Design a protein around this ligand. Structure first.
Ligand SMILES: [Zn+2]
Ligand SMILES: [Zn+2]
Ligand SMILES: [Zn+2]
Lengths: 487, 146, 76, 76, 79
């Protein structure tokens, strides 16, 4: 018989024996009979049953049989202990399959979240919320998640970004926070947490500076968990970002008033975020040939802001900005929320219907590698505002891009921006305390068995000498190889 | 002032000193208890000596009354557990913060000055025979610090 | 290589040093970094005075370590 | 929450605990990530030697609350 | 035919200090931020010839207790 049916057979037989005792056998024979049958049915086949059935049964999520299995195994002495192992080893075996394979990166977290929810459910229903199984569930996840350095943290970080992004309208407010709570129960198991911040911080940096966050209340909810989970020190730099966005809007009120008081206000409607350089991701400043009307707008602000706060210096980030360019096409006007590079390059495509890749480059000054990325956004994208000559996906130095005056698009407003030392010491005294007498050779052997890192012979001897000085250990009067426990 | 002590407490909780630890004993923030782990390569190795800080009502501009609770063998520290640092009585400086006074005490555990000693009885032993000093201090550490 | 030192004012500054370098030059670097005189520093590592006439390699100091700066004191 | 148990050398061992774990649990977690069995620890949090029966919530241990670990070589 | 015109603009800018925060040692505040006593409601920063920065409200009291700079041991005068 297979294990799932066999357990039903054992469940049946025990109750018959339990039924017999009430029927005609003396009650004093109640216990020895049950232990006798129980020993033979399960006590002699614990490993055999678990190997054959448990690993298969767990995968199928067969709730009743496991409940029967755990209920039955508790009767045997050490039966439950045997169930922890093959259940625990199952996690480290099937768990490693989730993380070890780099080809499953796109579908990593959801498996980890799903597989996390599954095993928790088995604990709540089958194993009767046994605290021992809860611990080894936690201890086991901590192990295999960390068999891949620094990638699970990256994917969990990337996962939370997707959930919070404005594109995540499908998950309502109540649904979202429950998802995060399951992540935070998973984020605990990671060891390289300092790598999670930088990946979550860089993503959170993009979220604020392009306003794609779905719910500000969901944002603040997230940090309220990290701050509670890792202290204000871990999330200190993060909260600085939110202040900067909060503070920037205040600056806009005062700055905008200044321009109104001035009779010379450019048609360009301006907004600038002021971000503390220490917290935000490091950006490399890069020069761009801004227009004479463009260069002025920073100058009034820079002087104004500096005039309001001495000792500062505003060094601009042209990369992170984005402007709007209303266009005059042949079938209606369109708007293009475009980064500064796209703004400057797209401001090279009206005087002449087209220009060479190099003709634009010295006009603006962008790096070639990123200018190509910009131009690809203007030619190869869905909103093909350029016609590449020759046509193709990738840009080349010989390209004479042609402005698309026949540009058609459904929306009116469009976007293009898609593109060991003490450890040795502690063990030595610990081992020698139990022994009360030992030689050098065995003391050296047990260390590597008891220490999980390399130990140099030179380093090992030095600790022994240091411990001799502190009276922890003493050599034999005639056998330097042999030590004795002092206290 | 409290706000000075609050800032010290927060900046100590965030970035603690290596072999030091101090925090309020109860509700009253003016009464801290600290702990100087014995500096390595010293007779005080492996020791944990508990202090008892008391901040005055003008703490930035007036020293705190730190006093050992664990009986320490030292020429500069009496059996009552009182210290006699010059920085702590005469040359107190507001810029010096509790994380710094504790570290300075930790350093001075290994750098006594038997000249002008608070305990001349031990100072004579230290000045004359340093070999016996490193054994009496060791036994005091073992019988109080561990 | 470089080393971290925690100045008195709460800030932290990083010193570019070599193990062969003597402590006197270390204090001079602290000076021209922020300017408290060579006499008044008392560098602390693992609760030990960093003696002026010695070098970092003497005290078993490596990369990404930390040195603590205090005000000069004396016994009593 | 996370408690980072930094020892004398400055190594900052990370640990995770629920708000109600008994400090014996904390020492056991330190055993797994650092290797010193719970008998030889003396955890010192903010100048109070933690006692082996108190719950972590007693001491107001929060996220990122750094403890201190000191070896008691005897350790029974 | 020929039209180089822009119609809107958003950007960002990172702000950094001219030299350094210049952490006050008496009160541990930030120099633009007011004195720790002055927060509880015109708190100017006063230099020493050491170039050491201190809030006037802190260094005045310390001077009233000691005519000595707390970091350096020189005497206190501004520029
Ligand atoms: Zn003030
Ligand atoms: Zn000065
Ligand atoms: Zn001040």
């Amino acid at each position: 018989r297979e294990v799932p049916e066999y357990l039903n057979h054992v469940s049946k037989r025990l109750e018959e024996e339990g039924d017999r005792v009430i029927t005609y056998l003396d009650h004093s024979t109640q216990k020895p009979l049950i232990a006798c049958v129980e020993k033979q049915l399960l006590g002699e086949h614990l490993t055999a049953i678990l190997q054959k059935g448990l690993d298969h049964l767990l995968d199928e999520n067969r709730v009743p049989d496991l409940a029967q299995m755990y209920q039955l195994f508790s009767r045997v002495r050490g039966g439950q202990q045997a169930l922890l192992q093959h259940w625990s080893e199952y996690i480290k075996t099937f768990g490693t399959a989730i993380v070890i394979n780099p080809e499953k990166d796109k579908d990593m977290v959801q498996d980890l979240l799903d597989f996390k929810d599954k095993v928790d459910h088995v604990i709540e229903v089958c194993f009767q919320k046994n605290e021992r199984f809860v611990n080894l569930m936690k201890e086991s996840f901590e192990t295999f998640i960390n068999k891949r350095p620094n990638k699970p943290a990256e994917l969990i970080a990337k996962h939370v970004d997707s959930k919070l992004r404005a594109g995540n309208k499908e998950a309502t407010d109540e649904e979202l926070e429950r998802t995060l709570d399951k992540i935070m129960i998973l984020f605990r198991f990671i060891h390289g947490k300092d790598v999670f911040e930088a990946f979550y911080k860089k993503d959170l940096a993009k979220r604020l500076l392009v306003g794609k966050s779905a719910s500000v209340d969901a944002e603040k909810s997230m940090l309220s968990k990290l701050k509670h989970e890792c202290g204000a020190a871990f999330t200190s730099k993060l909260e600085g970002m939110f202040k900067d966005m909060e503070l920037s809007k205040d600056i806009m009120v005062h700055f905008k008033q200044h321009m109104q008081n001035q009779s010379d206000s450019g048609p360009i409607d301006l907004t600038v975020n002021i971000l503390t350089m220490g917290y935000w991701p490091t950006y490399t400043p890069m020069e761009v040939h801004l227009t004479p009307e463009m260069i002025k707008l920073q100058e009034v602000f820079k002087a104004f802001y500096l005039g309001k706060h001495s000792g500062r210096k505003l060094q601009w980030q042209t990369t992170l900005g984005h402007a709007v360019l209303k266009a005059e096409f042949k079938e209606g006007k369109k708007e293009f929320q475009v980064s500064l590079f796209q703004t400057l390059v797209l401001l090279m495509f009206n005087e002449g219907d087209g220009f060479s890749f190099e003709e634009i480059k010295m006009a603006t000054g962008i790096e070639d590698s990123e200018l190509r990325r910009t131009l690809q956004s203007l030619a190869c994208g869905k909103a093909r505002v350029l016609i590449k000559s020759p046509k193709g996906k990738e840009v080349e130095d010989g390209d004479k891009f042609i402005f698309n005056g026949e540009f058609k698009h459904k929306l009116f407003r469009i976007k293009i921006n898609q593109i060991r030392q003490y450890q040795i010491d502690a063990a030595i005294v610990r081992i020698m305390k139990m022994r009360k007498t030992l030689g050098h050779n065995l003391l050296v052997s047990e260390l590597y068995n008891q220490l999980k890192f390399p130990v140099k012979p030179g380093d090992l001897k030095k600790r022994i000498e240091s411990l001799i000085d502190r009276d922890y250990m003493e050599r034999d009067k005639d056998n330097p190889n042999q030590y004795h426990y002092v206290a | 002032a409290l706000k000075r002590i609050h800032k010290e407490l927060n900046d100590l909780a965030r970035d603690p000193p290596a072999q030091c630890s101090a925090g309020p004993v109860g509700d009253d923030m003016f009464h801290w208890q600290a702990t100087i782990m014995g500096p390595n390569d010293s007779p005080y190795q492996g020791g944990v000596f508990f202090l008892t800080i008391h901040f005055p009502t003008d703490y930035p501009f007036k020293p705190p009354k730190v006093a050992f609770t664990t009986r320490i063998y030292h020429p500069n520290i009496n059996s009552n557990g009182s210290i006699c640092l010059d920085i702590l009585r005469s040359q107190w400086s507001p810029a010096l913060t509790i994380s710094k006074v504790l570290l300075s005490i930790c350093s001075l555990l290994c750098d006594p000055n038997p000249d002008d000693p608070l305990v001349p009885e031990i100072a004579r032993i230290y000045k004359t025979d340093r070999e016996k000093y490193n054994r009496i201090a060791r036994e005091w550490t073992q019988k109080y610090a561990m | 290589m470089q080393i971290f030192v925690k100045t008195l004012t709460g800030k932290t500054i990083t010193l570019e040093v070599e193990p062969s370098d003597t402590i006197e030059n270390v204090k001079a670097k602290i000076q021209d970094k922020e300017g408290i005189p060579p006499d008044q520093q008392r560098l602390i590592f693992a609760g030990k005075q960093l003696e002026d006439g010695r070098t970092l390699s003497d005290y078993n100091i490596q990369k990404e370590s930390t040195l603590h700066l205090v005000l000069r004191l004396r016994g009593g | 929450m996370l408690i980072k148990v930094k020892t004398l050398t400055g190594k900052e061992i990370e640990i995770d605990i629920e708000p109600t774990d008994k400090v014996e649990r904390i020492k056991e977690r330190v055993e797994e990530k650092e290797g010193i069995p719970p008998q030889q620890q003396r955890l010192i949090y903010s100048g109070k030697q933690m006692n082996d029966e108190k719950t972590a919530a007693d001491y107001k241990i929060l996220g990122g609350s750094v403890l201190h670990l000191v070896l008691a070589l005897r350790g029974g | 035919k020929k039209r180089f015109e822009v119609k809107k603009w958003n950007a960002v800018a990172l702000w950094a200090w001219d030299i350094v925060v210049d952490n006050c040692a008496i009160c541990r505040n930030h120099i633009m931020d007011l004195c720790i006593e002055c927060q509880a409601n015109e708190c100017t920063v006063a230099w020493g010839v050491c170039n050491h920065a201190f809030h006037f409200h802190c260094i005045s009291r310390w001077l009233k207790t000691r005519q000595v700079c707390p970091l350096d041991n020189r005497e206190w005068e501004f520029q």
